[PDB]
Assembly symmetry: C5
Homo-oligomer: 310 residues x 5
C-alpha cells in the first residue's frame, strides 16, 4: 500500500525571468502533508500534541527509527536554492507537516521566441518523488499550490496557473510521482513599442520627408546611414535573446528594413545616374515612384510578415 504525500507549491515572488539564459527565478513555499503511523506518539496532558522540528533533527529521528521519508527533487532547479524555512510539525497521529521556503532559479526549456516580442510562454516547476508509486503517491495539497499576488514582475503578466500530477522514471525504472506547477505569462510590449518600433518608424518617416528635397545624393547618404542604424538595432535586439538557431519575427522585421533600405540606395543610385547622364528631367519623372515606393515597400513589408508569421 503506497502512503500518500500532499504536495503544495506556492510562488510568492518572480524575482525575474532571464530570457537570454532561458530560466526564471522565484521566492516559493513548498508544503507537504504526509501521515506516518510509525511517527505517532502519546503526550501526557500539559505536553503539546504537536511537535516542532528542524528538518536537521527530524531526519536524524527518521534515521534512528529507520523510517523512509518521501524524498523528492526539484527536477528543473538550476544552481543553489537559498532556503529560509525547512520546518516539520508532527501531530499525535503521526501526520508530518513539512514547510520549505526558498529562492531558486528554474529551467524554462519551454521557450518559443518564434513570435518575439509577441510570444506567450510556459514556465513550470517539477517536484519529483525519488521513490516509485508502489511506496509513495503524490496527491494535490488543496487550497495552497498556485501564484501569490505580489510577484513584482513588470514585463511579463501571467495568463493562468495549472496544477496536476504525472510520472517520471529518472533514477527508478518503476513509475514515480511528479507534482507540476505550470504557468503561462505574456509580454508587456510597451518596452518594445517605446524603444524599438517607435524609433525605427521615426527614422523611416523622417528619412522619407527628405525625399521632397529631390537630392538623390542626400537620399543615398541618408538610406546608407539608416542601414547602420538598423544594424545597431539588430545588436540591441540580439542581446535580449539567446544565440537561437531559429529565426525570430523580430529577426524578419529587421532583415525586412535591411532589404528595403539597400534597394532605396540602389534605386536612388540609378535616379542619380540619370542626372549624371543628362536625363535630369526623366529622373524627375521617375521620382514620384521613388517617393511613393518608400511607404509602400515598408507597408508591403507589414503584410509580408503579418501574414508569414500570423
Amino acid at each position: 500500500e503506497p502512503s500518500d504525500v500532499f504536495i503544495g507549491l506556492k510562488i510568492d515572488q518572480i524575482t525575474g525571468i532571464n530570457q537570454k539564459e532561458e530560466n526564471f527565478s522565484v521566492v516559493g513555499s513548498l508544503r507537504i502533508d504526509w501521515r506516518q503511523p510509525l511517527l505517532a506518539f502519546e503526550h501526557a496532558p500539559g505536553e503539546p500534541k504537536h511537535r516542532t522540528y528542524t528538518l536537521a533533527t527530524f531526519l536524524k529521528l527518521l534515521e534512528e527509527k529507520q523510517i523512509r521519508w518521501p524524498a523528492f527533487t526539484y527536477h528543473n532547479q538550476q544552481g543553489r536554492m537559498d532556503f529560509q524555512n525547512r520546518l516539520i510539525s508532527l501531530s499525535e497521529d503521526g501526520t508530518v507537516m513539512y514547510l520549505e521556503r526558498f529562492t531558486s532559479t528554474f529551467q524554462a526549456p519551454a521557450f518559443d521566441f518564434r513570435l518575439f516580442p509577441f510570444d506567450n510562454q510556459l514556465f513550470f516547476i517539477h517536484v519529483d518523488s525519488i521513490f516509485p508509486q508502489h511506496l509513495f503517491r503524490f496527491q494535490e495539497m488543496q487550497g495552497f499550490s498556485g501564484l501569490g499576488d505580489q510577484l513584482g514582475e513588470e514585463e511579463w503578466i501571467v495568463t493562468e496557473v495549472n496544477t496536476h500530477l504525472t510520472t517520471h522514471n529518472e533514477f527508478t525504472k518503476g513509475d514515480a510521482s511528479r507534482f507540476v506547477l505550470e504557468f503561462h505569462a505574456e509580454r508587456h510590449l510597451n518596452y518594445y513599442l517605446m524603444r524599438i518600433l517607435i524609433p525605427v518608424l521615426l527614422i523611416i518617416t523622417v528619412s522619407w520627408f527628405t525625399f521632397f528635397l529631390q537630392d538623390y545624393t542626400k537620399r543615398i547618404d541618408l538610406a546608407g546611414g539608416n542601414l547602420l542604424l538598423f544594424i545597431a538595432f539588430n545588436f540591441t535586439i540580439s542581446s535580449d535573446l539567446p544565440r537561437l538557431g531559429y529565426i525570430t519575427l523580430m529577426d524578419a522585421f529587421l532583415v525586412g528594413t535591411f532589404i528595403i533600405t539597400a534597394l532605396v540606395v540602389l534605386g536612388n543610385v540609378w535616379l542619380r545616374r540619370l542626372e549624371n547622364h543628362g536625363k535630369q528631367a526623366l529622373a524627375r519623372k521617375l521620382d514620384i515612384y521613388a517617393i511613393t515606393s518608400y511607404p509602400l515597400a515598408y507597408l508591403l513589408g507589414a503584410l509580408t510578415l503579418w501574414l508569414l508569421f500570423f
Copy 2:
C-alpha cells in the same frame, strides 16, 4: 493564552536599491524578546543567571524540551541572507533574547515609475510568525525598530519610517502575526539634471542657434542628428528601469522631443522646398515662424507634460 514575542528590526545600511530588478538590499539587526516560563532555570551562586547560546544549540535545547519556538520568515526576502550574528540570551525567568544580524535583498514590489525621475517610493520588510495568533502574538519591541544613520545611500534620501503589526494566512488558515518595517525614500535628481536634462537642453538650444545661419539643409541635417541623439538617451534611460508595460514621465519627455524634432525636419524640408522652387524670398519670410516655433514647440511641450503628469 498566546505568549507574546517582541519584534525589533533596525536597518544599519542600505547596501543599494536596484530599481531595474525592483528590490533593495540592507544590513539589518533583528531583536526578539520572548518569555517562555518552561525555559526558566535556577543557578547556584557563582554561576551567571543569564545563559548565552549559539542558535544551533538553543534550538537543539528547545527540541530536547519539545518547546515550540515562535518560528518566523522574512516574507519579501530574495535569495540568501548572509547572517553575522544569531545569538540567544536566556534569564532565570526564561526570557529568550534572540539577536540576528544579516545582509539580505528584499522585494520592493511597491515601485511606481509613473513619475520617474520625480517619483518617491515605498520599501518594506515583512517579518511573519509562521504560527497563528492563538499560539504566538508579535508585539513591537520598543526603543529599537527603525533605520540607523550611516545607510550610505546617495541617490535616495529617506522621508520617514513606520512600524506596525498586522496578520497574514500564508501556510496557516488561522490568522498569523506580521511585523512590518516600511520606509519611503525619494530620489536626489542631481544625477538626472546633470547627465540628462542639462545636455538635452544644451543640444536643443545650441541646435536652435544654427537657425540664425538661415541654411535649411544644415537645419535638417542637424535635427536629423538630434533625433538619433534622443533615441540614444532613450536607451540610456530605458536601462535604469525594468521593461515596464506602463509609460514613464521620462518616456513622454523623450517621445516629446522625438515628435518636435521630426516636425522640425518636416518644416525645414518644406522651407527648403520653397528655395528649390524659386520662392527663396518667401521661405525667408516664413523663416521667422520656423525660428520661433522651436522655442515655443519645446515650451508648449513643458506644459503638455507638466499638466498631463502633474
Copy 3:
C-alpha cells in the same frame, strides 16, 4: 580483491556553455551502486529491509564501522557544486545506492576556435576514484549515464554522447578509475548569419552600388567608413571568444575585409588622382576595373578562406 562501484552520470540540463571562459554548466544526477558486505544487516520479518540515509549520517556510520567509502572527485569541476540530493539506500545485502543531483560548472579545455563559427567541440565530465584500482574499480552503471532531452541549450546542438572508463594518477601513484561522460555539440550558425554575415554583406553590396555614381571622393569616404564598421565587428566578435594566441577563421574573414577595404581606398585615391591631373576620361576608362574588382576581390576572398581553412 577490488570491490566494484557502478558509476551513472546523467545531464538533465545544459544551463549554458560560456565559450569566453572555456567552461560549460549542467544540472546533473550521479548514481552509484556499491555492494559492501560489511554494511549488510538483518531484515527481521515485519521490519524494512532497505535503510534510507542522509549522506551526513551514512558517512558517520561508515566512520563508526571504519569502512572505506569509494571516495571520488569531479576532476574538471570549476567553483561550487550546488547539490540538491545526496541520498543513500542500503539493502540487507549491503548494496549502497548513492544518488547525487547538482548544478556545477566544468572545464572544457577541449575548445578549438580555429574554425569559429563553424567549429564542433568536445564537452566532458571526469569522475575519478581518489583510491587506486587495487581497492575500488569503477564499472559502468548500465541504462542511466547519458544526456536528458530537455537540455534547453539553443546555440549548441549535441551530435553524440559516449561513456567509457580509464585510469589517472592524480594523488595516488597507483592506477585509479576515471568514469568519463563525453559529448560533442556543434553550433547553430543562424545567430552568426543574422547578426554578422548578413550585415557585413549588406554593407559591402550597398557600398558597391554607390560606385555607379562615379564619385571617387564619395567611394573613398565610404570605404574609410566601412573600415571602422569592420573594426567594430572586430570588437563584437573578439568578445564572444577568449584572448586566444591562435587565429580564428572569423579573424581571417575580418582582416580579409580590412585588406580589401584599405586597397579600395588606395585604388579610388589613384582614380581620383587622375581626375585631379586632367586625365578624367582615362580614370573613367579604368573605372570598369574598379567597379568589378570590388565583387571579385571579395569573392577571391571567399576562396582564400574556404580553401586555406577547409
Copy 4:
C-alpha cells in the same frame, strides 16, 4: 569586574575599493587575547599545556560550562565574510587566543566625491562587543593591528592607519566597546590624466587650430561635435560614481566645457551671420577675438574651478 579582550585586526589585502557602491573589500586577520580563569585546566606533566580548538567545539565547550564568550559583530560588514581560519588556543591559565582570517566587503559611508578625482577618503572597519563594558572591555592587542605591505591596490595609495577604541549602544542601552581600524588613502590621478584630462585638452587644442582656417561654418560644425564628445565624457565619468545628489569638481569641469562650447557655437554663428550680411571684412576684424576667446574662456575656466574648489 569587566574581563578585558585584546582586539587585533590586520588587513593583508585590499581586494578592491568599489567607489560606485561606496564600499571596499579586504582579506583580514582578527586576533583576540581573552583570559577566562574558568577555562583554566591542569596538565599532568608530559601532557601539552595548550589546547587547540575548532571555534565549532570551543563554543560547544563554553556552552557546556555556561561561560559567556565576548560576542562581537563587524558593524560596517556588507554581505558574507568568507572565513579561512577560526582557531582557538587555550593555555593552562585559561587565556583564549582566537584568530579569524576572512575576505569581506565593508561600508565606506566616509565617501566625499566633492573633489573627485583629487579627493582623499576614510576607510574604516568597526569591531563592536555586543555585550556592555560592565561585562567585557576591548583593549588594543599591541604589535598586530594595522595594514600589511602587499595590499595589491593600484589606484589608491594609503597615507596613514589609526587604531583606537570607543563605545556604541547598538542592542544594549549600556555603553559597549568598539575597536576601530581607520585608514586614509588618496587616488593615483595617472588614470584620470591619461584617459580624461589629456584627451579633452587635445580635443580643445586641436579644435582651436582649425580656427586659423577662418571657416566659421567649419568652427560651428566642430564645436557642435565637441559638445557630444563632452556629453560622452559626461557618461564615462558619471558611471565611475554613484547617482550623487551633490556636484563633483569633475561635474563642474564638464559643465564648464559645455557652457564654453555652446558659446563658441553662438559666437561663430554670429561671425558667420556677418559674412551672410555682406560684412565679411568686419567678421574678419572681430575674428581675432573669437580666436583668442577660445584659450582665455578655457583658462578663465581653469581658475573659476581652481579657486571655487581650492
Copy 5:
C-alpha cells in the same frame, strides 16, 4: 623537536587571470603528509590498517585526544574557496594523509603593467603554518607540487614553475613555515595584434593614402576623426587594466598617436592657411614634407618607445 609536515600543492586548472582586479583563479589539490605517533593504532586481522576520515570527524578526533593539527592558511587567498575534497587517511604508524581539492581566487600583487602588452608576470600561492617552526616545520612533499597540463588558459602561457620553503611572522612573532608555489606566465600577443595594433596601423596607413588627394581640408577632417578613434582605443585599453598611477607602454603608444595626429592637424591647417593667402603653389611645394612627415613621425615614434621602454 618540531614534527615535519609535507606540503604538496598542484594546480589542475587556471579558471582565469583577472588582470584588472590583479588576481588569478585556480582549481587546485593540496596534499599533506604529517606523522603523529599519538594517532597510531593497532588492529586485529580483519580491520584495515588505513582509516579514512571526513576532516569534520578527523578534527573532532584530534580535539578528543587534545592533539595539535599543523593549522595552515592560504595567505594570498581572496574570497571563498569552494572545496570538493577534504579527506584524511591515517596509517597504523599515525601518518596523517590530508587531501584538499578546491577552486579559489588568489592575490597576484606581483603585477607589472610597465610593458603591457609585452609584460611577463609572477603568480604565486602562499601556504603558511599558523604555528611557529619550534612546533611544525613545512617540508616539500616530492613528486606532486607543480602545474597540470590542462590549465585551459589561452591568453597566458606558463614559462616555468618553482617550489620553495621560507618563513613569515603573521600572527606569531616566532618564525613560521611558508610553502610557496610560484609560476611565471607571459601573454599571447595575437589578441593585441589582431584587435589593437592591426586596426591602428590600417587607420594610420589608409589615412595617409588620402594625402595624395592634396585636399588639406580633407586631411584635417580625417586626422581629427582619427584622434577620436584613438581616444576610443584609449578607453578599450584603459579598461583591461586597473587605474594604475604608473604609465603603461600601451599608454605611451596611444599618447604617441595623439601627439602626431594633433600636429598632422596643425601642419595641414598651416598648408591650408597658405592656399587661403594666395600661396597655393608654395603649399604644394611644402606638401612633399607633409606627405613624408606622416610615415617618419610614426616611425621616429616606433624608436622613441622601443628605446625608452626597451
